[PDB]
Design an enzyme around this catalytic site. Structure first.
Site, PDB file in Angstrom:
ATOM      1  N   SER C  90       0.845  -1.227   0.000  1.00 48.77           N
ATOM      2  CA  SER C  90       0.000   0.000   0.000  1.00 48.77           C
ATOM      3  C   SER C  90       0.874   1.270   0.000  1.00 48.77           C
ATOM      4  CB  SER C  90      -1.070   0.047   1.150  1.00 48.77           C
ATOM      5  OG  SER C  90      -0.478  -0.216   2.475  1.00 48.77           O
ATOM      6  N   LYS C 133      11.946 -10.088  -0.263  1.00 42.06           N
ATOM      7  CA  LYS C 133      12.400  -8.905  -0.833  1.00 42.06           C
ATOM      8  C   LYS C 133      13.934  -8.797  -0.752  1.00 42.06           C
ATOM      9  CE  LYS C 133       8.045  -6.446  -0.054  1.00 42.06           C
ATOM     10  NZ  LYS C 133       7.150  -5.607   0.898  1.00 42.06           N
TER      11      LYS C 133
END
Lengths: 196, 196, 196, 195, 195, 196
Positions: C90, C133
């Site tokens: 987000s 990641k």
């Protein structure tokens, strides 16, 4: 049968399509117009994006060459029957032809099928599945089939089948119209308008 | 045949794609612009999203380096034929050339295939299937192939195949236009605006 | 690959994602801003609603600390690469950092990746998939990964992975910028701005 | 039973559909019309665009013949039953016929099923799955099934289906109505409307 | 880690949700408001319909007791992290409580989780997964969890787990607030209004 | 516990449904109505499409029996709890009753469960899973269950069970409201409007 293979009807065109990966099908189209009194294009089911696109592309060729303006009309299109597994062509010419047939009040020869992608500018673009389509047309007992000029070398027909249907290649929408529209005054006066 | 291999046409571009994972195919596109009369991207069939998305992404350099806001136009794109199993370039340089081309009224060399994704900054970025795509350009009788500068090392042709097509690596969209747009006064004025 | 592992480049940011499960990816964002010839975020694909969310949040923060009003302006945000199953962050700080770069015309260290969510007040919120990641950042040969401060204890990293990248914890947007903007008069002008 | 099969009902018509393949179904449509405060067509589900197309074609029919404007009314089109997968016929004649029944407050013979597409000018157009649909008018226990005339030759019923239903080929919307509207004063008023 | 367990934060609330069809997770939310200079609710990911729903309901409650009007504000909402596999509760009270917080500038107690669904009237409705939500709250080192009153008989904890967390049953939004908002003048003033 | 088993509440209805294919469940619903900020139907979670279908199908009836237009209000619907794997009835009577209830301010008896689909003509049509639904109603300790008149033969209660619940078959909307709406002057007035 879902298609008519003879005589003449306003707003009706035998198109052609492919189903599963090989086979061809006749794809009969009906167009109607009523004043919208802007206008909408009304079609439902699996091939309706194709109808809106064919209509958008003919509306400009219609406004440009002649009087009428498709903005002011609802254009009501069906493919006669249901068409799952069916891939039609983008901006399909049979649909634009039906529309031109409805607006002019001039009947289309149903013994002729056709396959073609319409450019806004009124060219007939090539299309896939052309051999399987002409085959379906031979099968439906159709007499002629209109195809894009650039699909000429894709026609892979056994000698006996080239005696069975005429293959008429076109490269513009006026030539489609000369071929399928019923002979008469109204056709004569439309063909004039189309000098270019 | 779905593509044209020589001559110049407005809004017409021989892009390159990969059918499933096995092979390249030529992916000829036409784009055409009309006044909006809010403006849309009209495309159908199996690669429609890719085409809207691609025009979305290029509208950037289309207004920003040059003239028009695409929300002032309808952009009409077709893939000439049917394209199931085909994976199309994100942000494709073929669609962006087709559109720039149709808007400027400047014809494009059909003998030159191309592949690449257009960055929002006007870079041309690496794509997959470059050896495949060029092998299809070769098999289709196309004379040149524009590719990303970053794919220069992914071109793995034989001795024979390297003499058959000119591979041209490009790093920016101005170069792509320079290599395909028809020589002329209009080209000249458009190139002088891809300043810096 | 398609992307960038060292160097400085305006408005281009090595973000990070997960492919769902636990398959980290480098996700290059490219941003471009031109005057709206109000404005709009032009983004494509499934992450486009996050591009808008990150834009919104960086407008507030930029307006507030520099007065620069990002509202007369078309921000194009592109995601680089061909992914499906893309879960994004987000208000992702990659998108924000890109936009800032793009607006301010100040280059971004390409050797740095980052992951984070930005609040309106411009905190950097923690995110999922931290270990993944960081492994994609390693696996891409990058040097530095900006992560959220509060994610510091979700960093795992086996032997074959610790000591292999500089991992950088951050709690605020000036921090992120402090590590990735290129030094000079404009990063200087702008950094005092956040403070004032 | 679920649906009706016997008798007469305002506004409800046993349509026929297909659950895609060789797989016919009875598909009741119920319609309701109120005047508006223009008006709109309220349908839900995967067939609402067709409920709209059926309605839009019948408004044109009604305003030319009758003169009744359906622009002044909200038309509610409901499909009966929990059918998934379900191909529909464009401008479906069950849907138009239901609306017409609702508008003119005249009951429909439930003993009859129908399939057909309606054109603006009032033709009824051949539709797919026509043997499948007739078979399902049979396993439902219906008496008549109305089929487009241009579908006669895609009737291919076997032994165990031959002689079991009365097949009614039709080319025209007046025809459909002739056969399903309950006889009396209002049907008779409304028939002569058309011709 | 994704949530704060201690202290006090404006517009931040530890909600609770279920992953798969069991396991609970702590669901932290941030809400933030900016003038709209019409308002839009901004939220992205699998839970955003829930977020725009919580805000629509707390709107009408804020307006009715406070005079303020969410229509002229932009409400920005995030779930901290990504929440695939997860169902949130209809109208969830942890979202609505983060919103009243942002708007009134009063910190929320980060050491209390909450689950429930908010009615446009201010009632806290029951929810599913309440035991797994509580376990998740215990696992995360939360000290109190607010649940719907009608969910009391669904709290099924071993005695050792009973000792580890305070369960606080509520039936209306103002109780929530009384229980999580930081003490002070602004709380006292707010609670006076909801009475 | 997700539903109330006694007393009267405005806009609250104990519907009944089918969890997978095993069994019946109590589906409690609340409907709240507020002035439109035109009017929507607001619902989330797994059964939000159904809620909207239902309010949509019933609004004609909703307007002839109040005379509020549903497009003049926002209808806020929740199913209390989460129900994944649950089949709602289409055109649900319990959703119509909640709505009609919310709008008139008239409370509904919680001791009465219902199942049924609402014809656009105010008829109660048969639904699947009746014995199953009734059996969840008996285990919930509900006192009556209203069903479609047409499922009267589908109620296979395997006594002791017959003594435990009152099964009330209806063929019309009015009769559902008569059997659940709290007795008083408001109800009487409402019942009087059901006519010709």
């Amino acid at each position: 049968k879902l298609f008519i293979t003879e005589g003449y009807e306003v707003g009706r065109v035998n198109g052609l399509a492919v189903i599963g990966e090989s086979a061809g099908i006749v794809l009969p189209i009906i167009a109607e117009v009523t004043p919208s009194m802007e206008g909408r294009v009304i079609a439902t089911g699996r091939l309706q994006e194709i109808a809106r696109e064919a209509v958008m592309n003919v509306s400009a060729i219609i406004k440009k060459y002649t009087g009428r303006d498709i903005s002011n009309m609802d254009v009501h299109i069906q493919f006669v029957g249901t068409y799952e597994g069916v891939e039609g062509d983008s901006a399909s010419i049979s649909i634009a032809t039906a529309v031109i047939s409805a607006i002019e009040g001039i009947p289309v020869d149903q013994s002729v099928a056709m396959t073609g992608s319409l450019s806004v500018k009124g060219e007939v673009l090539p299309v896939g599945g052309v051999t399987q389509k002409i085959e379906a047309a031979i099968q439906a007992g159709l007499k002629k089939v209109i195809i894009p000029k650039d699909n000429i070398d894709d026609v892979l027909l056994d000698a006996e089948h080239e005696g069975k249907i005429e293959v008429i290649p076109v490269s513009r929408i006026n030539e489609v119209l000369e071929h399928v529209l019923e002979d008469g005054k109204k056709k004569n006066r439309l063909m004039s308008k189309f000098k270019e």
